[PDB]
Coordinates of C-alpha atoms in Angstrom, one line a residue:
Chain A
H1 CA 40.5 -3.1 -53.0
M2 CA 43.9 -1.7 -53.8
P3 CA 44.5 2.0 -54.4
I4 CA 45.6 3.4 -57.7
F5 CA 49.4 3.7 -57.4
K6 CA 50.7 7.0 -58.5
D7 CA 53.9 5.5 -59.8
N8 CA 55.3 1.9 -59.9
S9 CA 57.3 2.3 -56.7
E10 CA 54.1 2.7 -54.7
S11 CA 52.9 -0.7 -55.8
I12 CA 55.5 -2.7 -53.8
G13 CA 54.5 -5.7 -51.7
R14 CA 51.0 -7.0 -51.0
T15 CA 52.4 -10.5 -52.0
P16 CA 50.4 -13.7 -51.5
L17 CA 50.9 -16.5 -49.0
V18 CA 50.7 -19.9 -50.6
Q19 CA 50.3 -23.2 -48.7
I20 CA 52.9 -25.9 -49.6
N21 CA 51.2 -29.3 -50.1
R22 CA 53.5 -31.9 -51.6
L23 CA 56.9 -31.0 -50.2
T24 CA 55.1 -31.1 -46.8
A25 CA 53.4 -34.5 -47.3
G26 CA 53.4 -36.4 -44.0
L27 CA 53.9 -33.3 -41.9
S28 CA 51.5 -32.2 -39.2
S29 CA 52.6 -28.6 -39.4
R30 CA 51.6 -26.0 -42.1
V31 CA 54.2 -24.3 -44.4
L32 CA 53.2 -21.0 -46.1
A33 CA 55.4 -19.4 -48.7
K34 CA 55.3 -15.6 -49.3
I35 CA 55.8 -15.0 -53.0
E36 CA 58.0 -11.9 -53.3
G37 CA 58.6 -12.5 -57.0
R38 CA 55.2 -10.8 -57.4
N39 CA 56.7 -7.3 -57.0
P40 CA 56.9 -4.4 -59.4
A41 CA 60.3 -5.5 -60.6
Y42 CA 59.8 -9.1 -59.5
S43 CA 61.8 -9.4 -56.2
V44 CA 61.6 -8.7 -52.5
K45 CA 64.3 -6.0 -53.0
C46 CA 61.7 -3.8 -54.7
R47 CA 60.4 -3.0 -51.2
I48 CA 63.8 -1.6 -50.0
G49 CA 64.6 0.1 -53.4
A50 CA 61.4 2.1 -52.9
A51 CA 61.8 2.6 -49.2
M52 CA 65.4 3.8 -49.3
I53 CA 64.6 6.3 -52.1
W54 CA 61.5 7.6 -50.3
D55 CA 63.3 7.9 -47.0
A56 CA 66.1 9.9 -48.6
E57 CA 63.6 12.2 -50.2
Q58 CA 62.0 12.7 -46.8
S59 CA 65.3 13.5 -45.1
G60 CA 66.6 15.7 -47.9
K61 CA 69.5 13.4 -48.7
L62 CA 68.0 13.0 -52.2
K63 CA 66.6 15.9 -54.2
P64 CA 65.3 16.1 -57.8
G65 CA 68.2 16.2 -60.2
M66 CA 70.5 14.4 -57.9
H67 CA 72.3 11.2 -58.9
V68 CA 71.9 7.8 -57.2
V69 CA 74.7 5.3 -56.9
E70 CA 75.0 1.9 -55.3
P71 CA 77.3 -1.1 -55.6
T72 CA 75.2 -4.2 -56.3
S73 CA 75.3 -7.2 -58.6
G74 CA 71.9 -8.6 -57.4
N75 CA 68.3 -7.7 -57.1
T76 CA 68.9 -4.5 -55.2
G77 CA 70.2 -3.0 -58.5
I78 CA 67.1 -4.0 -60.3
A79 CA 65.0 -2.6 -57.5
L80 CA 66.8 0.8 -57.5
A81 CA 66.7 0.9 -61.3
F82 CA 62.9 0.6 -61.6
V83 CA 62.4 3.1 -58.8
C84 CA 64.7 5.7 -60.3
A85 CA 63.0 5.2 -63.6
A86 CA 59.5 5.7 -62.0
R87 CA 60.5 8.7 -59.9
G88 CA 62.9 10.4 -62.3
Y89 CA 66.4 10.0 -60.9
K90 CA 69.7 9.3 -62.8
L91 CA 71.1 6.0 -61.5
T92 CA 74.5 4.6 -61.6
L93 CA 75.2 1.0 -60.5
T94 CA 78.7 -0.5 -59.9
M95 CA 79.3 -4.2 -60.0
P96 CA 82.1 -6.6 -60.9
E97 CA 82.2 -7.4 -64.6
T98 CA 81.3 -11.0 -63.6
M99 CA 77.6 -10.0 -63.5
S100 CA 75.6 -11.8 -66.1
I101 CA 74.6 -10.2 -69.4
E102 CA 70.9 -10.8 -68.8
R103 CA 71.0 -8.8 -65.6
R104 CA 72.9 -6.0 -67.4
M105 CA 70.2 -5.9 -70.0
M106 CA 67.5 -5.7 -67.4
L107 CA 69.2 -2.8 -65.7
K108 CA 69.9 -0.9 -68.9
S109 CA 66.2 -1.3 -69.9
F110 CA 65.4 1.0 -66.9
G111 CA 68.1 3.4 -68.1
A112 CA 70.6 2.6 -65.3
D113 CA 74.2 3.5 -66.0
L114 CA 76.5 0.6 -65.3
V115 CA 80.1 0.9 -64.1
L116 CA 81.7 -2.5 -64.4
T117 CA 84.7 -3.0 -62.1
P118 CA 87.5 -5.6 -62.5
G119 CA 86.4 -9.1 -61.8
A120 CA 89.8 -9.7 -60.0
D121 CA 88.8 -7.1 -57.4
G122 CA 85.4 -8.7 -56.7
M123 CA 82.6 -6.9 -54.8
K124 CA 85.2 -4.8 -52.9
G125 CA 86.2 -3.2 -56.2
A126 CA 82.6 -2.4 -56.9
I127 CA 82.1 -1.0 -53.5
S128 CA 85.1 1.3 -53.5
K129 CA 84.2 2.6 -57.0
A130 CA 80.6 3.4 -55.8
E131 CA 81.9 5.1 -52.6
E132 CA 84.2 7.3 -54.8
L133 CA 81.4 8.2 -57.1
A134 CA 79.1 8.9 -54.1
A135 CA 81.5 11.4 -52.6
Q136 CA 80.8 13.8 -55.5
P137 CA 78.5 16.6 -54.5
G138 CA 74.9 15.9 -55.6
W139 CA 75.3 12.1 -55.5
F140 CA 73.3 9.9 -53.0
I141 CA 74.2 6.3 -52.0
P142 CA 71.6 4.2 -50.2
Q143 CA 73.9 1.7 -48.6
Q144 CA 71.7 -1.4 -48.5
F145 CA 73.7 -3.2 -45.8
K146 CA 73.5 -0.2 -43.4
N147 CA 70.3 1.8 -44.2
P148 CA 67.7 1.4 -41.4
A149 CA 65.0 2.1 -44.0
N150 CA 65.7 -1.4 -45.3
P151 CA 64.4 -3.4 -42.3
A152 CA 61.9 -0.6 -41.6
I153 CA 59.9 -1.2 -44.7
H154 CA 59.6 -4.9 -43.7
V155 CA 58.3 -3.7 -40.3
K156 CA 55.7 -1.6 -42.2
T157 CA 54.7 -3.9 -45.0
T158 CA 56.1 -7.5 -45.1
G159 CA 55.4 -8.2 -41.4
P160 CA 51.9 -6.8 -41.3
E161 CA 51.0 -8.7 -44.5
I162 CA 52.1 -11.9 -42.9
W163 CA 50.2 -11.1 -39.7
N164 CA 47.0 -10.0 -41.4
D165 CA 46.9 -12.8 -44.0
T166 CA 47.5 -15.5 -41.4
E167 CA 45.1 -13.8 -38.9
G168 CA 47.9 -14.0 -36.3
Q169 CA 48.6 -17.7 -36.9
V170 CA 52.4 -17.7 -37.3
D171 CA 54.7 -19.7 -35.0
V172 CA 57.9 -19.9 -37.0
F173 CA 59.5 -17.5 -39.6
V174 CA 62.3 -18.8 -41.8
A175 CA 64.2 -16.4 -44.1
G176 CA 67.4 -16.4 -46.0
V177 CA 69.7 -13.6 -45.0
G178 CA 71.3 -11.3 -47.6
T179 CA 71.2 -7.8 -46.0
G180 CA 69.1 -9.3 -43.2
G181 CA 66.5 -6.6 -43.7
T182 CA 63.6 -9.0 -44.3
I183 CA 64.2 -11.2 -41.3
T184 CA 65.0 -8.2 -39.1
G185 CA 61.8 -6.3 -40.0
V186 CA 59.4 -9.2 -39.9
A187 CA 60.9 -10.5 -36.6
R188 CA 60.8 -7.0 -35.1
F189 CA 57.2 -6.6 -36.1
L190 CA 56.0 -10.0 -34.9
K191 CA 58.0 -10.0 -31.6
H192 CA 58.1 -6.3 -30.7
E193 CA 55.0 -4.7 -32.2
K194 CA 52.6 -7.7 -31.9
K195 CA 54.3 -9.3 -28.9
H196 CA 53.8 -12.7 -30.5
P197 CA 56.0 -15.7 -29.8
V198 CA 57.8 -16.7 -33.0
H199 CA 60.8 -19.0 -33.6
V200 CA 62.8 -16.9 -36.1
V201 CA 65.3 -18.9 -38.2
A202 CA 68.0 -17.3 -40.4
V203 CA 69.1 -19.4 -43.4
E204 CA 72.7 -19.1 -44.8
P205 CA 74.8 -21.1 -47.1
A206 CA 76.7 -24.1 -45.7
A207 CA 79.6 -22.9 -47.9
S208 CA 79.7 -19.5 -46.2
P209 CA 78.2 -20.0 -42.7
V210 CA 79.3 -16.6 -41.3
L211 CA 76.4 -15.9 -39.1
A212 CA 77.1 -19.2 -37.3
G213 CA 80.8 -18.2 -36.8
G214 CA 82.3 -20.0 -39.8
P215 CA 84.6 -18.6 -42.5
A216 CA 83.2 -16.8 -45.5
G217 CA 83.3 -18.8 -48.8
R218 CA 82.1 -18.9 -52.3
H219 CA 78.6 -20.3 -52.8
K220 CA 75.9 -20.4 -55.5
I221 CA 72.8 -19.2 -53.5
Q222 CA 72.4 -15.8 -55.1
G223 CA 71.0 -13.2 -52.8
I224 CA 72.2 -14.6 -49.5
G225 CA 75.6 -15.4 -48.0
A226 CA 77.2 -11.9 -48.0
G227 CA 80.3 -13.3 -46.3
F228 CA 80.0 -10.8 -43.4
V229 CA 77.4 -9.9 -40.8
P230 CA 75.5 -6.9 -42.2
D231 CA 74.5 -3.9 -40.0
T232 CA 70.9 -4.4 -41.1
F233 CA 70.8 -7.9 -39.5
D234 CA 69.4 -7.8 -36.0
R235 CA 70.7 -10.9 -34.2
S236 CA 68.7 -10.2 -31.1
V237 CA 65.4 -11.0 -32.9
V238 CA 66.7 -14.1 -34.6
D239 CA 66.5 -17.4 -32.6
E240 CA 68.4 -19.8 -34.8
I241 CA 71.0 -19.9 -37.6
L242 CA 70.5 -22.8 -40.1
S243 CA 72.8 -23.7 -43.0
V244 CA 71.7 -25.2 -46.4
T245 CA 74.0 -26.6 -49.0
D246 CA 74.1 -25.3 -52.6
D247 CA 72.7 -28.6 -53.8
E248 CA 69.8 -28.6 -51.3
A249 CA 68.9 -25.0 -52.4
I250 CA 69.0 -25.8 -56.1
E251 CA 67.1 -29.0 -55.8
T252 CA 64.4 -27.6 -53.5
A253 CA 63.9 -24.7 -55.9
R254 CA 63.4 -27.2 -58.8
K255 CA 60.9 -29.1 -56.6
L256 CA 59.0 -25.9 -55.8
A257 CA 58.3 -25.5 -59.5
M258 CA 57.7 -29.2 -60.2
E259 CA 55.7 -30.2 -57.1
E260 CA 53.9 -26.8 -56.2
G261 CA 53.9 -24.9 -59.5
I262 CA 55.9 -22.1 -57.8
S263 CA 58.6 -20.8 -60.2
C264 CA 61.3 -19.3 -58.0
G265 CA 65.0 -18.7 -57.6
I266 CA 67.8 -20.5 -55.9
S267 CA 67.5 -18.7 -52.6
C268 CA 63.9 -19.6 -52.5
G269 CA 65.0 -23.2 -52.5
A270 CA 67.4 -22.5 -49.7
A271 CA 64.7 -20.8 -47.6
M272 CA 62.2 -23.6 -48.2
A273 CA 64.8 -26.3 -47.5
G274 CA 65.4 -24.7 -44.2
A275 CA 61.7 -24.1 -43.5
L276 CA 60.8 -27.8 -44.3
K277 CA 63.5 -29.0 -41.9
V278 CA 62.1 -26.8 -39.1
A279 CA 58.6 -27.7 -40.0
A280 CA 59.3 -31.4 -39.4
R281 CA 60.5 -31.0 -35.8
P282 CA 58.1 -32.5 -33.2
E283 CA 57.7 -29.3 -31.3
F284 CA 56.1 -27.6 -34.3
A285 CA 53.5 -30.3 -34.9
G286 CA 50.2 -28.4 -35.7
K287 CA 52.1 -25.1 -36.0
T288 CA 52.4 -22.7 -38.9
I289 CA 55.8 -22.0 -40.5
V290 CA 56.0 -18.9 -42.8
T291 CA 59.0 -18.5 -45.2
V292 CA 59.9 -15.9 -47.9
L293 CA 60.5 -16.8 -51.5
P294 CA 62.5 -13.8 -52.8
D295 CA 62.1 -13.8 -56.6
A296 CA 61.1 -15.7 -59.8
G297 CA 62.6 -18.6 -61.7
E298 CA 62.8 -16.8 -65.0
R299 CA 65.6 -14.6 -63.6
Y300 CA 67.7 -17.8 -63.4
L301 CA 67.5 -19.4 -66.9
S302 CA 71.3 -19.1 -67.4
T303 CA 72.3 -20.4 -63.9
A304 CA 72.8 -23.7 -62.3
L305 CA 69.1 -23.8 -61.4
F306 CA 68.2 -24.7 -65.0
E307 CA 71.4 -26.7 -65.6
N308 CA 69.5 -29.9 -65.8
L309 CA 67.1 -28.7 -68.5
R310 CA 69.8 -27.6 -71.1
Chain B
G1 CA 80.2 -18.2 -56.6
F2 CA 79.4 -15.2 -54.5
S3 CA 81.2 -13.6 -51.6
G4 CA 81.9 -10.1 -50.2
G5 CA 78.3 -8.9 -50.8
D6 CA 78.3 -10.1 -54.4
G7 CA 74.8 -11.2 -55.7
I8 CA 72.7 -9.0 -53.4
Chain C
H1 CA 43.6 -8.7 -46.2
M2 CA 44.3 -11.5 -48.6
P3 CA 43.4 -15.2 -47.9
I4 CA 45.9 -17.9 -47.4
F5 CA 45.9 -19.6 -50.8
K6 CA 45.5 -23.4 -50.7
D7 CA 47.6 -23.8 -53.8
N8 CA 49.3 -21.5 -56.2
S9 CA 46.4 -21.6 -58.7
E10 CA 44.1 -19.9 -56.2
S11 CA 46.5 -16.8 -56.0
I12 CA 45.7 -15.6 -59.6
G13 CA 45.0 -11.9 -60.2
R14 CA 44.7 -9.1 -57.7
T15 CA 47.0 -7.1 -59.8
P16 CA 47.8 -3.4 -59.4
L17 CA 46.8 -0.4 -61.4
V18 CA 49.7 2.0 -61.9
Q19 CA 49.3 5.6 -63.2
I20 CA 51.3 6.5 -66.3
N21 CA 53.1 9.8 -65.8
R22 CA 55.7 10.6 -68.4
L23 CA 54.3 8.9 -71.6
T24 CA 51.1 10.9 -70.8
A25 CA 52.9 14.3 -70.2
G26 CA 50.8 17.1 -71.6
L27 CA 47.5 15.0 -71.7
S28 CA 44.6 16.0 -69.5
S29 CA 43.3 12.4 -69.3
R30 CA 44.5 9.7 -66.9
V31 CA 46.0 6.4 -68.1
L32 CA 46.2 3.5 -65.7
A33 CA 48.1 0.3 -66.5
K34 CA 47.0 -3.1 -64.9
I35 CA 50.2 -5.1 -64.3
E36 CA 49.2 -8.7 -65.3
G37 CA 52.9 -9.7 -65.1
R38 CA 52.4 -9.9 -61.3
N39 CA 50.5 -13.2 -61.5
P40 CA 51.5 -16.7 -60.1
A41 CA 53.4 -17.6 -63.3
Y42 CA 53.8 -14.0 -64.3
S43 CA 51.2 -13.4 -67.0
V44 CA 47.5 -12.6 -67.6
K45 CA 47.0 -16.2 -68.8
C46 CA 47.4 -17.5 -65.3
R47 CA 43.8 -16.4 -64.8
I48 CA 42.5 -18.6 -67.6
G49 CA 44.9 -21.5 -66.9
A50 CA 43.4 -21.7 -63.4
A51 CA 39.8 -21.1 -64.5
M52 CA 39.7 -23.6 -67.4
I53 CA 41.1 -26.3 -65.1
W54 CA 38.7 -25.4 -62.2
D55 CA 35.7 -25.3 -64.6
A56 CA 36.6 -28.7 -66.1
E57 CA 36.9 -30.1 -62.5
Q58 CA 33.5 -28.8 -61.6
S59 CA 31.8 -30.1 -64.8
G60 CA 33.6 -33.5 -64.6
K61 CA 35.5 -33.1 -67.8
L62 CA 38.7 -33.3 -65.8
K63 CA 39.2 -36.0 -63.1
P64 CA 42.2 -36.8 -60.9
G65 CA 44.6 -39.0 -62.9
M66 CA 43.5 -37.6 -66.3
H67 CA 45.9 -36.0 -68.8
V68 CA 45.7 -32.4 -69.9
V69 CA 46.8 -31.3 -73.4
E70 CA 46.7 -28.0 -75.3
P71 CA 48.4 -26.6 -78.4
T72 CA 50.0 -23.3 -77.3
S73 CA 53.2 -21.5 -78.2
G74 CA 52.7 -18.7 -75.6
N75 CA 51.8 -17.8 -72.0
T76 CA 48.8 -20.1 -71.9
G77 CA 51.2 -23.1 -71.8
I78 CA 53.0 -21.6 -68.8
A79 CA 49.7 -20.9 -67.1
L80 CA 48.5 -24.5 -67.7
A81 CA 51.9 -25.8 -66.6
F82 CA 52.0 -24.2 -63.2
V83 CA 48.3 -25.0 -62.6
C84 CA 48.8 -28.6 -63.4
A85 CA 51.9 -28.7 -61.2
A86 CA 50.0 -27.1 -58.4
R87 CA 46.9 -29.3 -58.7
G88 CA 48.5 -32.6 -59.7
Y89 CA 47.7 -33.2 -63.4
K90 CA 50.0 -34.6 -66.0
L91 CA 50.2 -32.0 -68.8
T92 CA 51.3 -32.3 -72.4
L93 CA 51.8 -29.2 -74.6
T94 CA 52.2 -29.3 -78.3
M95 CA 54.0 -26.5 -80.2
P96 CA 56.0 -26.0 -83.4
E97 CA 59.6 -27.3 -83.0
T98 CA 60.9 -23.8 -83.4
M99 CA 59.8 -22.6 -80.0
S100 CA 62.6 -20.9 -78.2
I101 CA 64.6 -23.0 -75.8
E102 CA 64.0 -20.4 -73.0
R103 CA 60.3 -21.0 -73.2
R104 CA 60.7 -24.7 -73.3
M105 CA 62.9 -24.7 -70.2
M106 CA 60.2 -22.8 -68.3
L107 CA 57.6 -25.3 -69.3
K108 CA 59.6 -28.3 -68.4
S109 CA 60.5 -26.8 -65.0
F110 CA 56.8 -27.4 -64.2
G111 CA 57.0 -31.0 -65.4
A112 CA 55.1 -30.4 -68.7
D113 CA 55.7 -33.0 -71.4
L114 CA 56.6 -31.2 -74.7
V115 CA 55.6 -32.6 -78.1
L116 CA 57.3 -30.6 -80.8
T117 CA 55.6 -30.6 -84.2
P118 CA 57.4 -29.9 -87.6
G119 CA 58.2 -26.2 -88.0
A120 CA 57.0 -26.0 -91.6
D121 CA 53.5 -27.0 -90.3
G122 CA 53.4 -24.1 -87.9
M123 CA 50.6 -23.8 -85.4
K124 CA 48.3 -25.9 -87.6
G125 CA 50.6 -28.9 -87.0
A126 CA 50.6 -28.4 -83.3
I127 CA 46.8 -28.0 -83.2
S128 CA 46.4 -31.3 -85.1
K129 CA 48.7 -33.2 -82.8
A130 CA 46.9 -31.9 -79.7
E131 CA 43.4 -32.7 -81.1
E132 CA 44.6 -36.3 -81.8
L133 CA 46.1 -36.7 -78.3
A134 CA 43.0 -35.1 -76.7
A135 CA 40.7 -37.7 -78.5
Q136 CA 42.3 -40.5 -76.3
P137 CA 40.1 -41.5 -73.4
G138 CA 41.3 -39.9 -70.2
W139 CA 42.6 -36.7 -71.9
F140 CA 41.2 -33.2 -71.5
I141 CA 41.8 -30.3 -73.8
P142 CA 40.9 -26.8 -72.5
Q143 CA 40.6 -25.1 -75.9
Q144 CA 41.7 -21.5 -75.0
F145 CA 40.0 -19.9 -78.1
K146 CA 36.6 -21.5 -77.4
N147 CA 36.2 -22.1 -73.7
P148 CA 33.7 -19.7 -72.1
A149 CA 35.5 -20.1 -68.8
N150 CA 38.2 -17.9 -70.4
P151 CA 36.1 -14.7 -70.6
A152 CA 34.1 -15.7 -67.5
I153 CA 37.2 -15.5 -65.2
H154 CA 37.7 -11.9 -66.4
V155 CA 34.1 -11.2 -65.6
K156 CA 34.7 -12.6 -62.1
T157 CA 38.2 -11.2 -61.3
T158 CA 39.9 -8.8 -63.8
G159 CA 36.7 -6.7 -64.3
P160 CA 35.8 -6.2 -60.6
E161 CA 39.5 -5.4 -59.8
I162 CA 39.4 -2.6 -62.3
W163 CA 36.0 -1.4 -61.2
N164 CA 36.8 -1.5 -57.4
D165 CA 40.4 -0.2 -57.5
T166 CA 39.3 2.8 -59.6
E167 CA 36.2 3.4 -57.4
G168 CA 34.1 3.3 -60.5
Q169 CA 36.2 5.8 -62.5
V170 CA 36.8 4.0 -65.8
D171 CA 35.7 5.6 -69.0
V172 CA 37.8 3.8 -71.6
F173 CA 39.2 0.2 -71.5
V174 CA 41.9 -0.7 -74.0
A175 CA 43.1 -4.3 -74.5
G176 CA 45.2 -6.2 -76.9
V177 CA 43.3 -9.2 -78.3
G178 CA 44.8 -12.7 -78.4
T179 CA 41.9 -15.0 -77.4
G180 CA 39.8 -11.9 -76.7
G181 CA 38.9 -13.3 -73.2
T182 CA 40.3 -10.3 -71.3
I183 CA 38.5 -7.6 -73.4
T184 CA 35.3 -9.7 -73.5
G185 CA 35.1 -10.4 -69.8
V186 CA 36.1 -6.9 -68.7
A187 CA 33.6 -5.3 -71.1
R188 CA 30.8 -7.7 -70.1
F189 CA 31.4 -6.9 -66.4
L190 CA 31.5 -3.2 -66.9
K191 CA 28.7 -2.8 -69.4
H192 CA 26.3 -5.6 -68.4
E193 CA 26.9 -6.3 -64.7
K194 CA 27.6 -2.7 -63.6
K195 CA 25.6 -0.9 -66.3
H196 CA 28.5 1.4 -66.7
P197 CA 29.3 3.5 -69.8
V198 CA 32.8 2.6 -71.1
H199 CA 34.4 3.0 -74.5
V200 CA 36.0 -0.4 -75.1
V201 CA 38.9 -0.5 -77.6
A202 CA 40.5 -3.7 -79.0
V203 CA 44.1 -3.5 -80.2
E204 CA 45.5 -5.7 -82.9
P205 CA 48.6 -5.7 -85.1
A206 CA 48.6 -3.5 -88.1
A207 CA 50.3 -6.4 -89.9
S208 CA 47.5 -8.8 -89.0
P209 CA 44.2 -6.6 -88.8
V210 CA 41.7 -9.5 -88.8
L211 CA 39.2 -8.1 -86.3
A212 CA 38.9 -5.1 -88.6
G213 CA 38.3 -7.5 -91.5
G214 CA 41.8 -7.4 -93.0
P215 CA 44.0 -10.3 -94.0
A216 CA 45.9 -12.3 -91.5
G217 CA 49.7 -11.9 -91.6
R218 CA 52.9 -12.5 -89.6
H219 CA 53.8 -10.1 -86.9
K220 CA 56.1 -9.8 -83.8
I221 CA 53.6 -8.7 -81.2
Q222 CA 53.6 -12.0 -79.3
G223 CA 50.3 -12.9 -77.6
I224 CA 47.9 -11.0 -79.9
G225 CA 47.1 -11.2 -83.6
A226 CA 45.9 -14.8 -83.7
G227 CA 45.1 -14.6 -87.4
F228 CA 41.4 -15.4 -86.9
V229 CA 38.4 -14.0 -84.9
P230 CA 38.3 -16.2 -81.8
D231 CA 35.0 -17.5 -80.5
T232 CA 36.1 -16.1 -77.1
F233 CA 36.1 -12.6 -78.6
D234 CA 32.6 -11.0 -78.3
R235 CA 32.5 -8.2 -80.9
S236 CA 29.2 -6.9 -79.4
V237 CA 30.9 -5.4 -76.4
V238 CA 33.8 -3.8 -78.3
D239 CA 33.3 -0.3 -79.5
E240 CA 36.5 0.4 -81.5
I241 CA 39.4 -1.5 -83.1
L242 CA 42.8 0.0 -83.4
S243 CA 45.9 -1.3 -85.2
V244 CA 49.4 -0.9 -83.9
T245 CA 52.7 -1.4 -85.8
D246 CA 55.3 -3.9 -84.6
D247 CA 57.8 -1.0 -84.3
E248 CA 55.5 1.2 -82.1
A249 CA 54.6 -1.8 -79.9
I250 CA 58.3 -2.6 -79.3
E251 CA 59.2 1.1 -78.8
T252 CA 56.4 1.7 -76.4
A253 CA 57.3 -1.4 -74.4
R254 CA 60.9 -0.1 -74.2
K255 CA 59.6 3.4 -73.1
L256 CA 57.4 1.8 -70.4
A257 CA 60.6 0.4 -68.8
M258 CA 62.7 3.5 -69.4
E259 CA 60.2 6.3 -68.6
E260 CA 57.9 4.5 -66.0
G261 CA 60.0 1.7 -64.5
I262 CA 57.5 -0.9 -65.8
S263 CA 59.3 -3.9 -67.2
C264 CA 56.8 -5.5 -69.7
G265 CA 56.5 -7.4 -72.9
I266 CA 55.9 -6.4 -76.5
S267 CA 52.1 -6.7 -76.4
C268 CA 52.2 -4.4 -73.4
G269 CA 53.7 -1.7 -75.7
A270 CA 51.0 -2.5 -78.2
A271 CA 48.2 -2.0 -75.7
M272 CA 49.8 1.1 -74.3
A273 CA 50.4 2.6 -77.7
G274 CA 46.7 2.3 -78.5
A275 CA 45.7 3.6 -75.1
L276 CA 47.9 6.6 -75.4
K277 CA 46.3 7.5 -78.8
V278 CA 42.8 7.3 -77.3
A279 CA 43.9 9.2 -74.2
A280 CA 45.2 12.1 -76.3
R281 CA 41.8 12.7 -77.9
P282 CA 40.2 15.9 -76.5
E283 CA 36.8 14.2 -75.9
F284 CA 38.5 12.1 -73.1
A285 CA 39.9 15.1 -71.3
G286 CA 39.5 14.5 -67.6
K287 CA 38.5 10.9 -68.2
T288 CA 40.2 7.7 -67.1
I289 CA 41.7 5.2 -69.6
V290 CA 42.5 1.7 -68.2
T291 CA 44.7 -0.8 -70.2
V292 CA 46.1 -4.2 -69.5
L293 CA 49.9 -5.0 -69.6
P294 CA 49.9 -8.8 -70.0
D295 CA 53.3 -9.9 -68.8
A296 CA 56.9 -9.0 -67.8
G297 CA 60.0 -7.9 -69.7
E298 CA 62.3 -10.7 -68.6
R299 CA 60.4 -13.3 -70.6
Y300 CA 61.6 -11.3 -73.7
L301 CA 65.3 -11.1 -73.2
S302 CA 66.0 -13.1 -76.4
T303 CA 63.5 -11.2 -78.5
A304 CA 63.3 -8.0 -80.6
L305 CA 62.4 -6.1 -77.4
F306 CA 66.0 -6.2 -76.3
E307 CA 67.8 -6.0 -79.7
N308 CA 68.9 -2.4 -79.0
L309 CA 70.6 -3.6 -75.8
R310 CA 72.4 -6.6 -77.5
Chain D
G1 CA 56.1 -13.9 -87.3
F2 CA 53.0 -15.2 -85.5
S3 CA 49.9 -16.4 -87.2
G4 CA 47.1 -19.0 -86.8
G5 CA 47.1 -18.7 -83.0
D6 CA 50.9 -19.0 -82.7
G7 CA 52.4 -17.2 -79.6
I8 CA 49.3 -17.2 -77.4

């Protein structure tokens, strides 16, 4: 059974693996999707929102009454928001004013204070404002692209869940890279802790193929394609960089809902498009491919994902 | 679209 | 560990219990919230969408190639939609033509065919159209308010999860009643299968107190207050009926997000409002009160729940 | 306003 969780941050993870059946028709491999939308605030980021706060509590970087600040226009903000609501911290988030109203409402429902920076200054404007706020005494900044607690929680939770649920039957791991914490921690756990051979594939947007050495660019695959190589990405445990187009990501997310009944976001379509390409290669005949689906389709009602349904 | 860490 | 799920319908349930800490400040009882938003299509109904389909497969009422139809303007349609997408059934849903576009987009993302019925005719018109369609050979209608497989899945899953996660420490169970399947199945499991004393409390809208014998009326607590006593509600296992106003349901759902970091819907606030009243009674000092939170806050962005955040 | 099974 599960324990009784003493607050919502403790309930992170323990997400299911679901076999893909129709998108894989005609393959001899097996593709399993890990449903990270089933998290306390409905994305994979909940794991690192909890872990970065806990780690800072343990180190004394975060004390009761202190103020948390982070620049983020994605799921990390929602993750930090629910954790700070559950554990009692004042939270400020900075983000370009381009962030959708729906995400703003979700953050405000947790009592997060939003500082909207000029759209013209992009994410760099949000980052500089958060760094300025974080320099105030009594303010703590988790730094999702640098904080080792980010990949560490995937070593401690995501990786073991995959290993235990497959009973050690995992030959390929495919994951989209935002911070890289997910792929770093799962790969470190499978390769270093379990000494298990695994072909680890990082998925990035074709429109911003920075891990593969290309130029950063604008893309629509929310949650990946940071446009730089994050410190939390461990290239030494990744075997392959694979690009996916915006259209492939969007279309495969739509097909996950239509053909598998898995309601998921755009980067879920990107990860799955990559996983299905790898799963079709002759060398993985009869092997097991595991991929991560980061969040849920309802968070995307206003985006290009649902463009075709009015 | 997203760049510079936007959307994460 | 968890099994590998052969399709997404198999992954229903296994939802966490989370202790409520600030809304309970000053109480000597313990209030645990079961987070049914963490289901494969993100509500408690996922359990009965799966179970009603599985049951009809086992009895032969549903065969490959047949058509599923149900009148539903709520989460049951989403549950049937992802199950039918996962298991390969054509699904038609009927509903008044005034259903929000956001809910219709979610349903169509699973490939459900939507038949809108005139808005003046309300739910009666949708029910009539579904019964007409269901009378065609080759068509199956689950009937969420009559199907015994609805409470049975709560006897088999929800109830044991509560029993096992609490290690048998559950003295009160509080549940909003829509179909009544949740409260019926959990109470049957605890009282009849485990012979365990538990005070079972049903929650209904003050504006539509039909279980208490009052007149049906219109209310804003989506998912409860059906306006009739459903066949799937077994009054003989319910010990008490509480009514909750629309305003205290909405406010308590907002406070669950703000004070506990639990993003949930309006009926979650209704259930928690009743649970908190029972938990404050001195006779439950030291006792454990369990309540169900049926779904997640993001499904309510365009509703009264978020009016205060524009 | 929900009634008659609406919203479930």
